[PDB]
C-alpha cells in the first residue's frame, strides 16, 4: 500500500532527521526493489485510462498501485507489474487505439517494459534473461 507512495519512508523526514537516515551506513548500497514505476503524460486519453482502467480494474488486480498527481504527469508505482491493454483503452475511448497510440503519452518506465500484441507491460521481471521475449 503506502510503501509505494512518492513520499514513502525516508521521504517523510525533514531536516536533521532526513540526513541521519540518508547517511546511515545501511543506505550506502542499493536495495533490490520488486516495484515498477510508470509515468503517464496527462492528456484526455490518459486521464480516462487512469480513472477507468488503472484505478479500477488495475488496482483490483494489483492493490499495491499508488497513483500520484505530479501536475503535468501521473506518477504510478506498483509491485511486480502493471498491464495496460490498448484494446481495452480503445473501447473506453470509442476510437481506434493501438499499443503504439497508447505510447504517445507513456512518458517513462522504471522497469522492464515491452509491447506484445495490444498489450503494454511494465514488469519487475528481467525480460530476456529470466523470461524470453516472443513474437505474436
Amino acid at each position: 500500500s503506502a510503501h509505494n507512495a512518492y513520499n514513502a519512508g525516508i521521504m517523510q523526514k525533514t531536516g536533521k532527521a532526513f540526513a541521519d537516515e540518508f547517511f546511515a551506513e545501511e543506505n550506502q548500497v542499493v536495495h533490490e526493489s520488486n516495484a515498477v514505476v510508470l509515468v503517464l503524460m496527462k492528456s484526455d486519453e490518459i486521464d480516462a485510462i487512469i480513472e477507468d482502467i488503472v484505478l479500477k480494474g488495475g488496482k483490483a488486480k494489483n492493490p499495491s498501485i499508488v497513483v500520484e498527481d505530479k501536475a503535468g504527469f501521473w506518477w504510478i508505482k506498483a509491485d511486480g507489474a502493471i498491464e495496460i491493454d490498448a484494446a481495452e483503452a480503445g473501447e473506453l475511448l470509442g476510437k481506434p487505439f493501438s499499443v503504439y497510440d497508447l505510447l504517445i503519452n507513456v512518458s517513462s518506465t522504471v522497469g522492464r517494459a515491452y509491447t506484445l500484441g495490444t498489450k503494454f507491460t511494465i514488469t519487475s521481471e528481467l525480460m530476456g534473461l529470466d523470461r524470453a521475449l516472443t513474437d505474436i
Binding site: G15, A19, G72, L126
Partner: protein, 515 residues
C-alpha cells in the same frame, strides 16, 4: 484462378513484419562491428518494442501534431511564453540547450551501438533511438526557439549554440552528455548513455523538471519534455538489452562492473550538483528538496529496480555510490558558489536566493545558512547585483584563498576550501604539465588513461586575459553589442555592460601556479 479469390479486407500489421526482422541479417566473415570493444553482443537478442519504420513515423508524428498544436495554437493564444517566472525562464536557457547536446550526441552514440550489435532486432532498437535523438535535438531547439519569440528575454535563448562556449559549466556538460556518449568502448558508452544517463538521470532532468517548470509558470517545457521522455523509455530498454546481449560473455564478468561504476560516477559527478543547482537556485517556487528528488529517482527507484534487480546477473551496487550520496546532499550548494561567483561567463540571468528562499534552504539543508547563506548575503551587501559596484565575486574568492580548480577529468569546478561535497584536491605534474584532479574515481581514470583526458580548461585558455575581453570575443552580449547576456539579477533595469565588467579588472589566473 483468374476468377476465384478471397476478397476480405486485409492489411499487414506492424508486428507481422517485425517477426521477420531477425532474418534480415546474413552471415559473412567481415560482418563485425568497426568499433573497439571488450564485449561480444549475442546474435540472438530480441528487442522489447516491436517497431518498424512506417509505424515509427506514424507514432512520432501523432506525438508531434498534439505537441505543436498545444504550443503554436493554444499556449500562444494564451500568451504562455511570457508568464514564466524570470528565474525559470532563464534556467531554461541552460537546461534545454545543454540537454540539446545530449540529444545530439546520443544520435551518434546510438548509431555506434547499432554498429556494435549483431542481432537485427537489437540494431533496430538502436536505430529507433538514432531517429528519436534527432527528434529531441529539434525539440530542445524548438523550446529555445519558442522562448526566443515569446519570452521577455530572448538573449541566450537565441544564440546558446555559440554563447555556451564562453563558460565552464558547458565543459562538464560536454563530458557527461557528449563525449561520454561517443568516445570509448561501445558498452561503456552505452552504460553512460542508456543505463545511467537515460534510465537513471533523464527522469530527474526531463520528467521531474516539468513539475518545477509548471510551478514557475512554464507550460511550454512540460508539453515538450514529457513528449521527449515517451521516446526516452524505449532507450532505457536499449540500455537493458545491451546488458542482456553481453550477459553470456565471459568478458562481462571481467569488465562490466568497472565500466558501470565508471559511467555512474561520470554521470553523477555532473548531474547531481548541476541539476540540484538549476532546480533549487534557478527557480522561485520549489517543488521538493533536490536531495529528496535524487533519493526517490536515483537512489531508491533506479538503484533498486535496475541495479539491485540485476544483482542476480553479477551487477554490483556501484562502489562510488557512497560518495555520490554526499554529493546529492551538498554538491549543488557547492556548485552554486561557483556559478554565482562566475556569472558573467554564462548566458543566463541569475537571482540570489531571497529571504524566503534562504529559509527554505536552511529548513531542508540544516547548516546551509551558516555556510552558503552568509556568503550570498555578504556578496549581496558588496554589490553583487549592482553594475556600478565594481564587484565580481570570483575575485572575492581569490582574495580570501577560496581558489577554483577545474577537474581535468569531469571539468566540474571545485572549491576545496568551501566544498561540503565529495572530493579533495590532488595536483600532479606529469611531463611538464600540471593537472588538478578532485576525487578518487576521477583520479584513477586520469592515472590509468591520461590520453583520454587532455581537455583544455577555461583558465588554461583565458589565462591573463581580462573578463570583458573574453565575453566580447565570445559574443556574450545582447544585440546592442554592449550589454551582457548574463546578469546577476532578474530585474529589467540596471543591466551590466562590458564597461561594468571591465571596471572590476578581473583577469584570469593560473590556479596551479602556486604549486
Amino acid at each position: 484462378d483468374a476468377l476465384k479469390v478471397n476478397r476480405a479486407p486485409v492489411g499487414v500489421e506492424p508486428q507481422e513484419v517485425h517477426k521477420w526482422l531477425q532474418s534480415f541479417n546474413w552471415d559473412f566473415k567481415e560482418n563485425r562491428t568497426k568499433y573497439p570493444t571488450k564485449y561480444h553482443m549475442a546474435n540472438e537478442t530480441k528487442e522489447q518494442f516491436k517497431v518498424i519504420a512506417k509505424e515509427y513515423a506514424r507514432m512520432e508524428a501523432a506525438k508531434d501534431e498534439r505537441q505543436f498544436g498545444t504550443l503554436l495554437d493554444g499556449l500562444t493564444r494564451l500568451g504562455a511564453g511570457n508568464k514564466v517566472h524570470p528565474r525559470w525562464g532563464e534556467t531554461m536557457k541552460v537546461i534545454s540547450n545543454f540537454l540539446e547536446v545530449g540529444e545530439y550526441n546520443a544520435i551518434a552514440a546510438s548509431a555506434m551501438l547499432w554498429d556494435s550489435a549483431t542481432a537485427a532486432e537489437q540494431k533496430n532498437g538502436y536505430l529507433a533511438q538514432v531517429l528519436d535523438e534527432i527528434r529531441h535535438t529539434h525539440q530542445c531547439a524548438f523550446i529555445n526557439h519558442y522562448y526566443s519569440k515569446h519570452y521577455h528575454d530572448p538573449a541566450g535563448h537565441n544564440d546558446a549554440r555559440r554563447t555556451r562556449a564562453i563558460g565552464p559549466l558547458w565543459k562538464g556538460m560536454k563530458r557527461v552528455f557528449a563525449d561520454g556518449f561517443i568516445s570509448g568502448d561501445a558498452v561503456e558508452c552505452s552504460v553512460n548513455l542508456q543505463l545511467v544517463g537515460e534510465a537513471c538521470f533523464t527522469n530527474p532532468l526531463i520528467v521531474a523538471v516539468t513539475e518545477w517548470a509548471s510551478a514557475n509558470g512554464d507550460e511550454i517545457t512540460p508539453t515538450v519534455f514529457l513528449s521527449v521522455e515517451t521516446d526516452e523509455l524505449r532507450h532505457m530498454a536499449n540500455g537493458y538489452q545491451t546488458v542482456v546481449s553481453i550477459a553470456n560473455d565471459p568478458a562481462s564478468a571481467k569488465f562490466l562492473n568497472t565500466d558501470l561504476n565508471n559511467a555512474f560516477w561520470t554521470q553523477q559527478k555532473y548531474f547531481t550538483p548541476v541539476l540540484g543547482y538549476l532546480f533549487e537556485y534557478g527557480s522561485k517556487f520549489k517543488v521538493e528538496p533536490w536531495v529528496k528528488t535524487w533519493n526517490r529517482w536515483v537512489y531508491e527507484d533506479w538503484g533498486g529496480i535496475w541495479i539491485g534487480r540485476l544483482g542476480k546477473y553479477g551487477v554490483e551496487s556501484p562502489a562510488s555510490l557512497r560518495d555520490a550520496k554526499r554529493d546529492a546532499y551538498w554538491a549543488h550548494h557547492d556548485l552554486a558558489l561557483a556559478a554565482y561567483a562566475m556569472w558573467p561567463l554564462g548566458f543566463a540571468r541569475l537571482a540570489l536566493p531571497d529571504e524566503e528562499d534562504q529559509a527554505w534552504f536552511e529548513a531542508n539543508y540544516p547548516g546551509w545558512a551558516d555556510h552558503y547563506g552568509k556568503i550570498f548575503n555578504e556578496w549581496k551587501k558588496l554589490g553583487y547585483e549592482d553594475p556600478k559596484s565594481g564587484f565580481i565575486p570570483y575575485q572575492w574568492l581569490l582574495a580570501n584563498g577560496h581558489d577554483v580548480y577545474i577537474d581535468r577529468v569531469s571539468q566540474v569546478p571545485f572549491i576545496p576550501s568551501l566544498a561540503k561535497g565529495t572530493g579533495s584536491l590532488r595536483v600532479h605534474e606529469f611531463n611538464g604539465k600540471k593537472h588538478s584532479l578532485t576525487d578518487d574515481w576521477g583520479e584513477r581514470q586520469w592515472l590509468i588513461e591520461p590520453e583520454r583526458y587532455e581537455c583544455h580548461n577555461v583558465f588554461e585558455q583565458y589565462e591573463g586575459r581580462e573578463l570583458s575581453e573574453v565575453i566580447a570575443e565570445g559574443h556574450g552580449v545582447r544585440s546592442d553589442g554592449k550589454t551582457l547576456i548574463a546578469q546577476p539579477h532578474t530585474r529589467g533595469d540596471n543591466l551590466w555592460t562590458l564597461e561594468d565588467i571591465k571596471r572590476a579588472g578581473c583577469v584570469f589566473p593560473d590556479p596551479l601556479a602556486k604549486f
